[PDB]
Write a protein that binds this ligand. Structure first.
Ligand SMILES: NC(=O)c1ccc[n+]([C@@H]2O[C@H](COP(=O)([O-])OP(=O)(O)OC[C@H]3O[C@@H](n4cnc5c(N)ncnc54)[C@H](O)[C@@H]3O)[C@@H](O)[C@H]2O)c1
Ligand SMILES: NC(=O)c1ccc[n+]([C@@H]2O[C@H](COP(=O)([O-])OP(=O)(O)OC[C@H]3O[C@@H](n4cnc5c(N)ncnc54)[C@H](O)[C@@H]3O)[C@@H](O)[C@H]2O)c1
Ligand SMILES: CC(=O)N[C@@H]1[C@@H](O)[C@@H](O)[C@@H](CO)O[C@@H]1O
Ligand SMILES: CC(=O)N[C@@H]1[C@@H](O)[C@@H](O)[C@@H](CO)O[C@@H]1O
Lengths: 426, 426
């Protein structure tokens, strides 16, 4: 009756998923696979806090997930591992017959992207792209407004991961602490272990899903529309080196590393039905958090400046606002057009509840498994978004040359229907 | 002692320059060249209003400017003609030995751009790019902050001409009126006569200077830095056709024209010293006016949302704001770092005065002529900005292919010094 879920990687993000599942009565958390004992310990404390019994632990090295996947009891797994581990963990899960919730990132290679889709089609095991910003309360209100016809026909959108990650990319290596040092790699903690290395060896749109995801759902990408091609420009890198010097002096070994990842990487994308999308990757500079959303059509325009609250944006609807030629605050619009799903289940996610947009993402994951239904953000969408990373790197290496984005759906995009948040439950 | 100025084209923008000159005691307005008697009449009324004597009128057809340029008394001319007339009027002026103030736009061809620079170098007659948004009060305050070191090292900027021009591109053809009809071409009035045709036959960044200009001055383009290459993406065109139908029904002949100009055209530009610039052209859709500025460096970030007032933006300075991670209103920063030029001469441009940013632009023009000094925004800058248009069209025709931007300075950019608003007078 209830879904048996396990976790490959219970680091800081894995722990969030553990909490979401631990708060449900329709799920049993069977097992964890993580080589770090400290991370496993906090995950076990989340279970104990929610009155659920401990999980079986597979903590013997990097390959112990293989032994966890042999458990026939497990229905589905969450994959919350480092970027370089996503493909190996995800395809091994589908081959073992486990439904997969895959954390966001970009692909290491374009080949990974195709292999996700091909393994999933052959095994018949579906995968969900765990993009939580698609469930953000303001974004869902805008989706509702778009579908009501309030924006008219969309022509353009922007978004991007613009979040100061300097204190996450560098720390002391002390368990549980960020922003308290200048170390990265083998001796660092959490994301500083693995993420910062990508900034050293690569230059591209390393994290596209948070900005492209919402636009995907609004412009029907892979569901009547698709992404055609892209071009990426990268600025110089200055922010990470400056951070290391300001926090840990010029004497530190890490003040000597030349970072390849430009501070701002912008990406233009053409869509089949004529829309354009501009993404921005911005994680090594001082700034407030703001994903920089813009949704623009023939009858409506929305721009945000915050982290998703009702009043943290501007909106203009010509025909509804008497051709005033002035921005309105987004506030009364986000509240009035709050998505039905949020209006119904608010108190499971906020106030008396917990998780926010993450509650709703993981709720859709579990409800689709219980109902035996296709995910609204599926393996084809994962592959598409993931492919933006390798193709952007090739664009930058070619001084901005245009790269065709593959059609991972093989013509299926033409007739596929948008099923993202089309009801008030999941 | 005083500068003798004449005007090729006294349409709506020419009239503004006429008023600026008519209010000065160090200028004599000698002559007008315009084939439209209605436009000449309002310009003559501006002189009469300011107690200055009438101008000699050259109104016999399109070529009568040639006869005006034979007047040896004329020191300088303002060129405020349609885009397709800029090159012919500008080079004929320099060849006749007249200093030129050239209105903004883009080039019709890349060849025009080179011919401006080559004619100017051969004749020895300088040309000023009349970019007024460079003198906008908030932009000048940000320039001041950048030069004070408050943004640290710049890595990225955005801007764009984002201004709803539907009521300017279509009118009834009645003299003096806009937004009152759906006609364009030979029977329309003012910009509807000529500008709208470009939307029908072309697709690109048709108007780059308002957004790139401010960034030019802040990133030292052509003055220690330069623009290397670009790539342009264009969305579908939907806004102009929809406007025609909503205002004048489907029965109108103009509801039948397929517009080539996409509603949103975005352009990525690489700079020599590592910065990137993204421009946006957005003139055929509903929206409030906002040029969408972003200035981003290692210690500061600014974004605006209005038409240039002090409180119509957000700003973040990590080290000055106690690492708060929250936007501040731009207001107290724009007021505290108001450019010296504005603080000194405020009452000549606003309040008791007139013109705003246009006062300051035309003041720099006249003061450079009186002092026999090089313009801060010169023929090389005109050519550079102008070249963004033809190269964007070629990029769009090549599905976003990267285009090299020529070096119109021939290596002079390396050692040239930024002289834009480096004093409190001009
Ligand atoms: N969508 C979101 O809101 C969101 C938020 C944070 C992180 N993330 C994503 O989640 C993923 C993980 O990020 P994080 O912040 O939790 O990093 P983290 O360093 O805290 O966690 C990674 C965990 O993976 C474990 N691990 C590494 N190799 C393994 C292996 N071979 N087998 C099993 N476990 C292994 C580590 O021991 C660690 O516990 C990344 O892809 C990141 O981008 C998404
Ligand atoms: N920088 C700014 O703030 C700003 C503002 C408005 C317009 N502009 C620019 O100014 C220019 C003109 O725009 P406008 O709004 O004044 O258009 P307009 O139609 O009102 O004026 C154009 C004038 O040029 C005249 N003209 C056409 N051909 C001529 C010729 N061969 N010889 C002499 N005169 C001729 C017309 O009769 C008309 O009076 C354009 O390049 C436009 O982009 C700049
Ligand atoms: C929605 C959101 O911004 N998510 C990001 C997540 O993807 C990851 O980058 C993390 C690093 O600490 O910071 C945020 O939580
Ligand atoms: C600074 C500013 O936005 N200038 C523009 C100008 O360039 C032109 O496009 C005009 C059309 O009516 O609208 C504005 O005044």
């Amino acid at each position: 009756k209830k879904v048996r879920i396990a976790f490959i990687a219970v680091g800081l993000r894995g722990q969030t998923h553990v909490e979401n599942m631990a708060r449900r009565d329709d799920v049993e958390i069977v097992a964890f696979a993580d080589p770090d004992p400290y991370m496993v310990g906090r995950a076990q404390e989340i279970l104990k806090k929610n009155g659920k019994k401990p999980a079986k632990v597979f903590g013997n090295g990097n390959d112990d997930y293989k032994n966890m996947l042999k458990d026939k009891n497990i229905d589905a797994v969450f994959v919350s591992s480092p970027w370089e581990w996503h493909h190996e963990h995800g395809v091994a899960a589908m081959k073992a017959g486990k439904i997969v919730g895959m954390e966001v990132s970009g692909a290491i290679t374009l080949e990974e992207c195709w292999d996700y889709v091909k393994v999933s089609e052959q095994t018949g095991v579906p995968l969900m792209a765990l993009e939580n910003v698609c469930y953000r309360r303001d974004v869902m209100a805008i989706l509702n407004m778009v579908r009501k016809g309030m924006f008219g026909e969309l022509v353009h959108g922007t978004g991007g991961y613009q979040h100061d990650l300097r204190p996450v990319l560098f720390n002391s290596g002390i368990n549980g602490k960020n922003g308290d040092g200048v170390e990265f790699g083998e001796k660092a903690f959490s994301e500083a272990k693995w993420r910062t290395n990508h900034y050293k060896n690569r230059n591209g749109e390393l994290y596209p899903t948070h900005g492209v995801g919402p636009l995907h759902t609004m412009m029907d990408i892979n569901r009547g529309n698709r992404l055609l091609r892209l071009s990426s420009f990268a600025s110089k890198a200055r922010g990470l080196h400056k951070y290391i010097v300001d926090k840990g002096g010029e004497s530190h070994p890490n003040a000597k590393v030349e970072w390849k990842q430009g501070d701002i990487v912008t990406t233009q994308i053409q869509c089949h039905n004529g829309e354009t999308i501009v993404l921005t990757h911005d994680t090594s500079l001082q700034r407030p958090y703001n994903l920089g959303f813009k949704v623009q059509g023939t009858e409506g325009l929305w721009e945000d400046f915050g982290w998703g609250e009702a009043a943290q944006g501007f909106i203009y609807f010509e025909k509804i606002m008497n051709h005033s030629h002035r921005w309105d605050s987004s506030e009364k619009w986000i509240k009035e057009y709050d998505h039905p799903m949020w209006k119904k289940h608010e108190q499971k996610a906020v106030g008396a509840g917990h998780g926010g947009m993450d509650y709703f993402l993981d709720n859709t994951f579990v409800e689709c498994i219980k109902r035996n239904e296709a995910f609204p953000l599926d393996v084809y969408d994962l592959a598409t978004w993931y492919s933006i990373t390798p193709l952007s790197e090739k664009s930058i290496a070619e001084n901005g040359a245009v790269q065709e984005i593959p059609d991972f759906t093989n013509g299926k995009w033409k007739n596929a229907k948008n099923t993202f948040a089309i009801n008030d439950d999941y």
